Short mmCIF file of C-alpha atoms in Angstrom, two decimals:
data_model
loop_
_atom_site.label_atom_id
_atom_site.label_comp_id
_atom_site.label_asym_id
_atom_site.label_seq_id
_atom_site.Cartn_x
_atom_site.Cartn_y
_atom_site.Cartn_z
CA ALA A 1 -31.25 -5.37 -17.63
CA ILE A 2 -30.31 -2.31 -19.71
CA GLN A 3 -27.88 0.52 -18.88
CA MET A 4 -27.45 4.01 -20.34
CA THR A 5 -23.86 5.26 -20.47
CA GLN A 6 -23.89 9.05 -20.76
CA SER A 7 -20.87 11.17 -21.66
CA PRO A 8 -19.46 13.49 -20.59
CA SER A 9 -20.36 14.10 -16.93
CA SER A 10 -19.93 17.87 -17.35
CA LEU A 11 -18.62 20.43 -19.81
CA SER A 12 -17.97 24.16 -20.07
CA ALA A 13 -18.58 26.27 -23.17
CA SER A 14 -19.08 29.88 -24.22
CA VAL A 15 -22.22 31.50 -25.59
CA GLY A 16 -22.45 30.36 -29.21
CA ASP A 17 -20.43 27.15 -29.01
CA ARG A 18 -21.72 23.81 -30.31
CA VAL A 19 -21.92 21.16 -27.58
CA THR A 20 -22.58 17.43 -27.84
CA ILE A 21 -23.87 14.86 -25.33
CA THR A 22 -23.72 11.14 -26.11
CA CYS A 23 -25.76 8.24 -24.75
CA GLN A 24 -24.82 4.59 -25.31
CA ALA A 25 -27.38 1.80 -24.88
CA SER A 26 -26.55 -1.69 -23.62
CA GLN A 27 -28.89 -3.38 -26.13
CA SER A 28 -31.04 -1.90 -28.92
CA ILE A 29 -33.95 0.33 -27.88
CA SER A 30 -34.88 1.10 -31.52
CA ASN A 31 -36.08 4.72 -31.30
CA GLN A 32 -37.49 4.79 -27.74
CA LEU A 33 -35.01 7.32 -26.39
CA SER A 34 -35.79 10.80 -25.05
CA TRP A 35 -33.71 13.78 -23.93
CA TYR A 36 -34.62 15.92 -20.92
CA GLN A 37 -33.28 19.13 -19.35
CA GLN A 38 -33.35 19.86 -15.61
CA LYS A 39 -32.66 23.19 -13.91
CA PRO A 40 -31.87 23.54 -10.18
CA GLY A 41 -34.84 22.96 -7.91
CA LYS A 42 -37.04 22.10 -10.91
CA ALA A 43 -38.32 18.88 -12.43
CA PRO A 44 -36.95 17.82 -15.83
CA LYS A 45 -38.56 19.05 -19.03
CA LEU A 46 -38.96 16.87 -22.11
CA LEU A 47 -36.69 18.20 -24.88
CA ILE A 48 -36.66 15.41 -27.48
CA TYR A 49 -38.62 12.20 -27.97
CA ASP A 50 -38.24 9.25 -30.37
CA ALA A 51 -34.54 10.08 -30.81
CA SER A 52 -34.91 13.02 -33.24
CA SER A 53 -38.36 14.59 -32.72
CA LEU A 54 -38.72 18.05 -31.20
CA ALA A 55 -41.14 18.76 -28.38
CA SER A 56 -43.65 21.61 -28.18
CA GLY A 57 -41.99 24.88 -27.23
CA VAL A 58 -38.34 23.80 -27.44
CA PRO A 59 -36.03 26.01 -29.54
CA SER A 60 -34.58 24.59 -32.75
CA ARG A 61 -30.99 24.80 -31.45
CA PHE A 62 -31.64 21.52 -29.60
CA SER A 63 -31.28 18.52 -31.91
CA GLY A 64 -31.22 14.75 -31.51
CA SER A 65 -29.66 12.07 -33.69
CA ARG A 66 -29.41 8.27 -33.73
CA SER A 67 -26.71 5.91 -35.01
CA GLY A 68 -27.56 2.34 -34.04
CA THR A 69 -27.25 2.35 -30.26
CA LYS A 70 -25.46 5.72 -29.96
CA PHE A 71 -27.72 8.73 -29.42
CA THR A 72 -26.50 12.33 -29.63
CA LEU A 73 -28.02 15.53 -28.26
CA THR A 74 -26.56 18.69 -29.79
CA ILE A 75 -26.94 22.29 -28.68
CA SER A 76 -25.89 24.22 -31.77
CA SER A 77 -25.66 27.72 -30.23
CA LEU A 78 -25.26 27.59 -26.45
CA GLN A 79 -27.30 30.29 -24.70
CA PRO A 80 -26.95 31.58 -21.13
CA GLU A 81 -30.28 29.89 -20.26
CA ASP A 82 -29.11 26.37 -21.15
CA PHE A 83 -27.22 25.97 -17.86
CA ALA A 84 -28.78 22.74 -16.56
CA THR A 85 -28.21 18.99 -16.33
CA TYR A 86 -29.22 16.93 -19.34
CA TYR A 87 -30.40 13.32 -19.20
CA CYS A 88 -31.26 10.56 -21.65
CA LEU A 89 -34.01 8.02 -21.00
CA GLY A 90 -34.12 4.71 -22.87
CA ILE A 91 -36.94 2.18 -22.60
CA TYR A 92 -36.54 -1.41 -23.83
CA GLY A 93 -40.10 -2.19 -24.85
CA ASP A 94 -42.20 -2.04 -21.68
CA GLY A 95 -39.54 -1.46 -19.00
CA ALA A 96 -39.62 -4.98 -17.54
CA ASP A 97 -36.33 -6.40 -16.23
CA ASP A 98 -35.20 -2.81 -15.53
CA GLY A 99 -35.98 -1.78 -19.10
CA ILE A 100 -36.31 1.90 -18.17
CA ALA A 101 -32.83 3.39 -17.84
CA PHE A 102 -31.71 6.95 -17.21
CA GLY A 103 -28.34 8.31 -18.22
CA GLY A 104 -25.76 9.50 -15.74
CA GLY A 105 -26.45 13.16 -16.56
CA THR A 106 -24.34 16.00 -17.99
CA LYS A 107 -23.95 19.32 -16.15
CA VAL A 108 -23.45 22.17 -18.63
CA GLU A 109 -21.66 25.20 -17.21
CA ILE A 110 -21.24 28.41 -19.22
CA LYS A 111 -17.98 30.23 -20.00
CA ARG A 112 -18.12 34.04 -20.02
CA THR A 113 -15.88 37.01 -19.34
CA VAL A 114 -14.55 37.72 -15.86
CA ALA A 115 -16.85 39.93 -13.74
CA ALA A 116 -15.95 41.26 -10.31
CA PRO A 117 -18.22 40.63 -7.32
CA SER A 118 -19.89 43.22 -5.16
CA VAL A 119 -18.70 42.33 -1.65
CA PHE A 120 -20.80 42.98 1.46
CA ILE A 121 -20.14 42.01 5.08
CA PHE A 122 -22.76 41.45 7.80
CA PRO A 123 -21.75 41.23 11.47
CA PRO A 124 -23.68 38.84 13.72
CA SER A 125 -26.82 40.35 15.22
CA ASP A 126 -27.35 40.90 18.94
CA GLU A 127 -30.29 38.48 18.79
CA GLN A 128 -27.78 35.79 17.77
CA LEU A 129 -25.15 36.90 20.30
CA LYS A 130 -27.67 36.31 23.10
CA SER A 131 -27.24 32.57 22.43
CA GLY A 132 -23.44 32.42 22.70
CA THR A 133 -22.66 32.03 18.99
CA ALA A 134 -21.74 34.60 16.35
CA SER A 135 -21.94 34.07 12.59
CA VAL A 136 -20.46 36.84 10.44
CA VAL A 137 -21.37 36.48 6.77
CA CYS A 138 -19.48 37.76 3.72
CA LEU A 139 -21.55 38.04 0.54
CA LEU A 140 -20.14 38.05 -3.02
CA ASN A 141 -22.83 39.07 -5.50
CA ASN A 142 -22.73 38.63 -9.30
CA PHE A 143 -19.21 37.43 -10.10
CA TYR A 144 -17.52 35.10 -12.59
CA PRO A 145 -15.86 32.64 -12.71
CA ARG A 146 -17.03 30.45 -9.84
CA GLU A 147 -13.45 30.34 -8.60
CA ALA A 148 -12.72 32.88 -5.87
CA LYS A 149 -10.31 32.92 -2.92
CA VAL A 150 -12.26 34.14 0.11
CA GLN A 151 -10.21 34.52 3.28
CA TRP A 152 -11.08 35.85 6.73
CA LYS A 153 -9.05 38.14 8.98
CA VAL A 154 -9.69 39.07 12.61
CA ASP A 155 -7.43 41.85 13.92
CA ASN A 156 -5.46 41.25 10.68
CA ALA A 157 -4.93 37.60 11.70
CA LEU A 158 -5.78 35.09 8.98
CA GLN A 159 -8.36 32.39 9.72
CA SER A 160 -8.55 28.80 8.48
CA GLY A 161 -10.77 25.83 9.25
CA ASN A 162 -13.32 28.24 10.67
CA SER A 163 -15.75 29.27 7.89
CA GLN A 164 -18.08 27.56 5.43
CA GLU A 165 -18.88 28.58 1.86
CA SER A 166 -21.96 28.19 -0.31
CA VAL A 167 -22.36 28.91 -4.03
CA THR A 168 -25.51 29.59 -5.97
CA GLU A 169 -26.16 27.92 -9.28
CA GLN A 170 -25.09 29.81 -12.40
CA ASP A 171 -27.45 32.70 -13.09
CA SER A 172 -29.82 32.00 -15.97
CA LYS A 173 -29.43 35.55 -17.38
CA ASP A 174 -25.83 36.82 -17.07
CA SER A 175 -24.16 33.45 -16.27
CA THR A 176 -22.94 34.82 -12.94
CA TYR A 177 -22.51 33.45 -9.42
CA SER A 178 -23.15 34.45 -5.83
CA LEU A 179 -21.08 33.18 -2.90
CA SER A 180 -21.59 33.30 0.86
CA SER A 181 -18.84 32.73 3.43
CA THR A 182 -20.00 32.25 7.02
CA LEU A 183 -17.42 32.58 9.81
CA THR A 184 -18.60 31.09 13.11
CA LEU A 185 -17.22 31.89 16.56
CA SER A 186 -18.23 31.73 20.20
CA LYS A 187 -19.43 34.89 21.93
CA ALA A 188 -16.16 35.06 23.89
CA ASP A 189 -14.01 34.81 20.75
CA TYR A 190 -16.11 37.59 19.20
CA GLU A 191 -15.67 39.89 22.22
CA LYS A 192 -11.90 39.18 22.33
CA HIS A 193 -11.29 41.25 19.16
CA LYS A 194 -12.33 44.39 17.28
CA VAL A 195 -11.52 44.40 13.54
CA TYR A 196 -13.10 41.77 11.28
CA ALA A 197 -12.64 41.54 7.52
CA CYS A 198 -13.09 39.28 4.52
CA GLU A 199 -10.71 39.50 1.57
CA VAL A 200 -11.83 38.24 -1.85
CA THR A 201 -9.06 37.46 -4.35
CA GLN A 202 -9.94 37.03 -8.05
CA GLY A 203 -6.79 36.89 -10.17
CA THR A 204 -4.71 40.05 -9.86
CA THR A 205 -7.24 41.83 -7.59
CA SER A 206 -7.91 41.28 -3.88
CA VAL A 207 -10.55 43.52 -2.29
CA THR A 208 -11.12 43.46 1.49
CA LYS A 209 -14.31 44.62 3.20
CA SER A 210 -14.11 45.13 6.95
CA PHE A 211 -15.87 46.44 10.04
CA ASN A 212 -14.80 47.14 13.61
CA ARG A 213 -16.85 46.16 16.65
CA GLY A 214 -18.61 48.91 18.57
CA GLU A 215 -17.76 51.80 16.25
CA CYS A 216 -20.70 51.86 13.81
CA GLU B 1 -53.48 24.08 -16.78
CA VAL B 2 -52.21 20.50 -16.61
CA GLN B 3 -50.45 19.83 -13.30
CA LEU B 4 -49.26 17.07 -10.96
CA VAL B 5 -48.99 18.30 -7.36
CA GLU B 6 -47.14 16.04 -4.92
CA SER B 7 -47.68 15.93 -1.16
CA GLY B 8 -46.24 13.86 1.65
CA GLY B 9 -42.63 13.32 2.50
CA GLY B 10 -40.30 14.55 5.20
CA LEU B 11 -38.30 12.90 7.98
CA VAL B 12 -38.78 9.14 8.44
CA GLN B 13 -36.88 6.82 10.75
CA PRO B 14 -35.05 3.82 9.24
CA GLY B 15 -37.40 0.89 8.89
CA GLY B 16 -40.35 3.29 9.11
CA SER B 17 -43.05 3.87 6.53
CA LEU B 18 -44.33 6.84 4.55
CA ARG B 19 -46.94 7.56 1.88
CA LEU B 20 -46.58 10.04 -0.97
CA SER B 21 -49.50 11.32 -3.03
CA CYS B 22 -49.76 13.01 -6.44
CA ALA B 23 -52.95 14.87 -7.36
CA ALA B 24 -53.59 15.48 -11.06
CA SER B 25 -55.34 18.57 -12.43
CA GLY B 26 -56.56 18.98 -16.00
CA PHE B 27 -56.75 15.30 -16.96
CA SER B 28 -57.53 11.86 -15.56
CA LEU B 29 -54.45 9.81 -14.64
CA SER B 30 -56.61 6.72 -15.21
CA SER B 31 -55.93 7.19 -18.96
CA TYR B 32 -52.12 7.18 -18.74
CA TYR B 33 -49.23 5.18 -17.41
CA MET B 34 -47.96 6.83 -14.24
CA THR B 35 -44.51 6.70 -12.71
CA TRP B 36 -42.53 7.49 -9.58
CA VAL B 37 -38.89 8.53 -10.16
CA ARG B 38 -36.41 9.43 -7.43
CA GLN B 39 -33.19 11.44 -7.29
CA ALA B 40 -30.77 11.25 -4.37
CA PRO B 41 -29.03 14.51 -3.35
CA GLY B 42 -26.45 15.56 -5.94
CA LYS B 43 -26.99 12.43 -8.06
CA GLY B 44 -28.88 11.25 -11.15
CA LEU B 45 -32.46 10.18 -11.84
CA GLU B 46 -33.43 6.68 -10.70
CA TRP B 47 -36.61 5.00 -11.92
CA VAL B 48 -38.72 3.70 -9.01
CA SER B 49 -42.11 2.41 -10.11
CA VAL B 50 -44.71 2.36 -12.89
CA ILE B 51 -48.46 1.76 -12.84
CA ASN B 52 -50.35 0.72 -15.96
CA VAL B 53 -53.63 1.98 -17.38
CA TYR B 54 -55.15 -1.39 -16.37
CA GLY B 55 -53.63 -1.21 -12.88
CA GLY B 56 -50.60 -3.42 -13.53
CA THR B 57 -47.64 -2.49 -11.34
CA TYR B 58 -43.96 -2.71 -12.33
CA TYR B 59 -41.23 -2.10 -9.75
CA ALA B 60 -37.43 -2.06 -9.69
CA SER B 61 -35.07 -4.72 -8.35
CA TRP B 62 -33.96 -2.77 -5.26
CA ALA B 63 -37.60 -1.89 -4.51
CA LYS B 64 -39.47 -5.12 -5.22
CA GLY B 65 -42.30 -5.83 -2.81
CA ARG B 66 -40.93 -3.03 -0.60
CA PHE B 67 -42.85 -0.17 -2.26
CA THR B 68 -46.41 -0.10 -3.59
CA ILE B 69 -47.77 2.17 -6.34
CA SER B 70 -51.52 2.74 -6.65
CA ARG B 71 -54.12 5.16 -7.96
CA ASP B 72 -57.55 6.31 -6.83
CA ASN B 73 -59.74 7.06 -9.85
CA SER B 74 -62.45 8.83 -7.85
CA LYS B 75 -59.95 11.20 -6.22
CA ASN B 76 -57.80 11.10 -9.40
CA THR B 77 -54.60 10.69 -7.40
CA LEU B 78 -51.44 8.57 -7.56
CA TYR B 79 -49.93 7.04 -4.41
CA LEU B 80 -46.58 5.53 -3.39
CA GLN B 81 -46.44 3.62 -0.09
CA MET B 82 -42.92 2.96 1.24
CA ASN B 83 -42.47 0.50 4.11
CA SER B 84 -38.90 -0.71 4.64
CA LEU B 85 -36.99 2.52 4.06
CA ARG B 86 -33.19 2.56 4.38
CA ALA B 87 -30.59 5.32 4.49
CA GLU B 88 -29.99 4.92 0.75
CA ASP B 89 -33.68 5.79 0.19
CA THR B 90 -33.39 9.49 1.08
CA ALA B 91 -34.14 11.32 -2.16
CA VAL B 92 -36.48 13.71 -3.93
CA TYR B 93 -39.40 11.69 -5.32
CA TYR B 94 -41.14 12.88 -8.50
CA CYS B 95 -44.52 11.94 -9.94
CA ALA B 96 -44.61 11.73 -13.73
CA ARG B 97 -47.06 10.99 -16.54
CA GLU B 98 -45.92 8.64 -19.29
CA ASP B 99 -47.30 9.02 -22.83
CA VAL B 100 -46.64 5.57 -24.34
CA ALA B 101 -49.14 5.95 -27.21
CA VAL B 102 -47.42 8.94 -28.87
CA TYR B 103 -44.20 10.22 -27.30
CA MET B 104 -42.90 7.01 -25.68
CA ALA B 105 -41.50 9.45 -23.11
CA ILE B 106 -42.48 11.47 -20.03
CA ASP B 107 -44.41 14.61 -20.97
CA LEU B 108 -45.57 15.79 -17.53
CA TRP B 109 -43.86 15.95 -14.13
CA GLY B 110 -44.53 17.34 -10.69
CA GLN B 111 -42.36 19.23 -8.25
CA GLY B 112 -40.51 16.75 -6.11
CA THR B 113 -40.94 15.97 -2.44
CA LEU B 114 -37.89 15.28 -0.28
CA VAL B 115 -37.98 12.07 1.77
CA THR B 116 -35.21 11.97 4.38
CA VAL B 117 -34.58 8.61 6.05
CA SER B 118 -32.60 9.29 9.22
CA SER B 119 -32.61 8.55 12.94
CA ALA B 120 -32.13 12.22 13.88
CA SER B 121 -35.01 14.29 15.25
CA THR B 122 -36.82 17.20 13.63
CA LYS B 123 -35.68 20.68 14.70
CA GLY B 124 -36.99 24.10 13.74
CA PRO B 125 -34.72 26.87 12.46
CA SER B 126 -33.46 30.03 14.12
CA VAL B 127 -33.84 33.07 11.85
CA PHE B 128 -31.46 35.96 12.56
CA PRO B 129 -31.28 39.25 10.62
CA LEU B 130 -28.49 40.23 8.26
CA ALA B 131 -29.19 43.93 8.78
CA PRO B 132 -28.47 46.58 6.12
CA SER B 133 -25.86 49.14 7.08
CA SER B 134 -25.57 52.90 6.47
CA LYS B 135 -25.40 54.56 3.07
CA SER B 136 -21.78 53.42 2.63
CA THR B 137 -22.88 50.40 0.60
CA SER B 138 -21.37 50.49 -2.91
CA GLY B 139 -23.46 53.48 -3.98
CA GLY B 140 -27.25 53.51 -4.04
CA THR B 141 -27.72 49.76 -3.57
CA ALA B 142 -27.87 47.98 -0.21
CA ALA B 143 -27.59 44.34 0.88
CA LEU B 144 -29.83 42.73 3.50
CA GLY B 145 -30.90 39.20 4.32
CA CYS B 146 -31.86 36.46 6.76
CA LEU B 147 -29.59 33.81 8.31
CA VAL B 148 -31.50 30.53 8.75
CA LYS B 149 -29.44 28.41 11.15
CA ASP B 150 -29.68 25.11 13.04
CA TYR B 151 -32.53 23.21 11.41
CA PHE B 152 -33.17 19.61 10.35
CA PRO B 153 -34.01 18.13 7.97
CA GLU B 154 -34.14 19.72 4.54
CA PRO B 155 -35.88 21.57 2.98
CA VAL B 156 -36.42 25.19 3.96
CA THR B 157 -38.23 27.70 1.75
CA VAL B 158 -37.49 31.42 1.96
CA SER B 159 -39.39 34.25 0.28
CA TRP B 160 -39.42 38.03 0.69
CA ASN B 161 -42.55 40.11 1.32
CA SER B 162 -44.80 37.08 0.77
CA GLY B 163 -43.47 36.68 -2.78
CA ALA B 164 -43.58 40.37 -3.78
CA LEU B 165 -39.77 40.76 -3.81
CA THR B 166 -38.08 38.36 -6.24
CA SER B 167 -35.44 40.27 -8.23
CA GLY B 168 -31.93 40.30 -6.85
CA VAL B 169 -32.82 37.62 -4.30
CA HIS B 170 -30.32 34.82 -3.67
CA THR B 171 -31.24 31.93 -1.36
CA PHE B 172 -28.04 29.94 -0.94
CA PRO B 173 -28.03 26.14 -0.76
CA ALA B 174 -27.86 24.58 2.68
CA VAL B 175 -24.56 23.54 4.27
CA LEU B 176 -24.31 20.59 6.66
CA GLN B 177 -22.53 21.82 9.79
CA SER B 178 -20.42 19.68 12.11
CA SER B 179 -23.41 19.48 14.49
CA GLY B 180 -25.52 17.57 11.96
CA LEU B 181 -27.82 20.57 11.46
CA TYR B 182 -28.23 22.63 8.30
CA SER B 183 -27.76 26.36 7.79
CA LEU B 184 -28.14 28.82 4.91
CA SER B 185 -28.77 32.48 4.11
CA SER B 186 -31.07 34.40 1.78
CA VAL B 187 -29.95 37.85 0.65
CA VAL B 188 -31.62 40.53 -1.47
CA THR B 189 -30.27 43.77 -2.94
CA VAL B 190 -32.45 46.90 -2.84
CA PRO B 191 -32.02 50.60 -3.55
CA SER B 192 -30.51 52.31 -0.52
CA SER B 193 -33.19 55.03 -0.56
CA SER B 194 -35.84 52.31 -0.05
CA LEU B 195 -34.73 51.73 3.54
CA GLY B 196 -36.81 53.55 6.13
CA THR B 197 -39.94 53.74 3.99
CA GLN B 198 -40.12 50.19 2.56
CA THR B 199 -40.31 47.19 4.90
CA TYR B 200 -38.45 43.93 4.20
CA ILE B 201 -39.72 40.66 5.72
CA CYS B 202 -38.22 37.26 4.93
CA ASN B 203 -40.62 34.30 5.05
CA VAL B 204 -38.94 31.11 6.28
CA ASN B 205 -41.00 27.93 5.88
CA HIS B 206 -39.95 24.54 7.32
CA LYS B 207 -42.73 22.07 6.51
CA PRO B 208 -40.92 19.08 8.13
CA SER B 209 -41.54 20.82 11.48
CA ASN B 210 -44.65 22.78 10.42
CA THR B 211 -42.79 25.97 11.36
CA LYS B 212 -43.08 29.31 9.57
CA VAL B 213 -41.00 32.37 10.51
CA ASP B 214 -41.58 35.94 9.35
CA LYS B 215 -38.65 38.18 10.31
CA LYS B 216 -38.77 41.90 9.48
CA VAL B 217 -35.21 42.96 8.62
CA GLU B 218 -34.57 46.51 9.83
CA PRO B 219 -31.49 48.72 9.38
CA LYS B 220 -28.93 48.76 12.19
CA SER B 221 -27.86 52.32 13.01
CA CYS B 222 -24.58 53.74 14.36
CA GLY B 223 -23.92 55.54 17.63
#
């Protein structure tokens, strides 16, 4: 009956900062603690074993340290490719009596300069209109930060409780994001109007991309 | 050259059973401890089961006598049989190799398989085109994509031109709609002068329903 208390749950830093993750053991696991990194959609990769030993093919800016029952994983110079979730694994002996314990995990976001999105808008296709439902999708490509106020207008009338948003994970190269806002209506509600638009607000700027039914 | 490939998993009704398998390539799993580790959606890693080099099986408290880990040495494959599945059992299950003689850690994993325990029924997706528009698209670049709507359960896999188009491709995570069905989009940016001469086909795969959709996205004109 052993538990791994990981801290913190998440943290943001800029490229070059020094970040620290801590793992507290319920009892004493001696040195049998390992650190792993997991990227979205992927299985974790072994970063550090036996508290302070480096794996094969892991850069030197990952380090591990032990102080009794407190284990520390340090990223000395954060790089844009370190965006992941980090876990500790402690094993009391053979794992019996729930001796194998994972940490809660730490999600590491990356702080960078503000970058404006490229905004596209796609009307619903006729193939989808044949079924009595219309989804118009607003795409925001390569922006930062993740925060962005995306609103919908139909005939310059603001919409609420009518769309759904989805965010990609932070890009592994330029630490950027991509957002999709899908506005769903019935075929009748789509035919009842003409001008559709999505407005993206990011600080002091608010760019609106639009299209009108029929004409083009 | 050393891999663990997992198969099995999909939609299972509560109280129903399922069997996951993990084929090893490049080594014999009979020489290592092997492990099954799960992860529920948006949560942490949860240890499930371990099998010894002798064949001794260790399980967890919540899955004691309910699951069964095994290995076939002739086929060189690990197995996890699940019998009394509950709603809290939906998760991505991973097969992992434990190196207790050197690392005292896990040095090899496999891609996960998603097991969804639910009473809902399997439904295939509808794939509509997000058509590229005229050359009024932020310069020389254009945006096109596929809208994958009304499917269940997860996951869906999208690719473009059978894996030939990868750069500038964004497949958004799925969103649970009010209807209990999922929906997502996959968009790609291309040079605007590519339209008309280069074809763009999105490849939607939905293994839970054994459905595969290839939709050629074509430009929508004006007039």
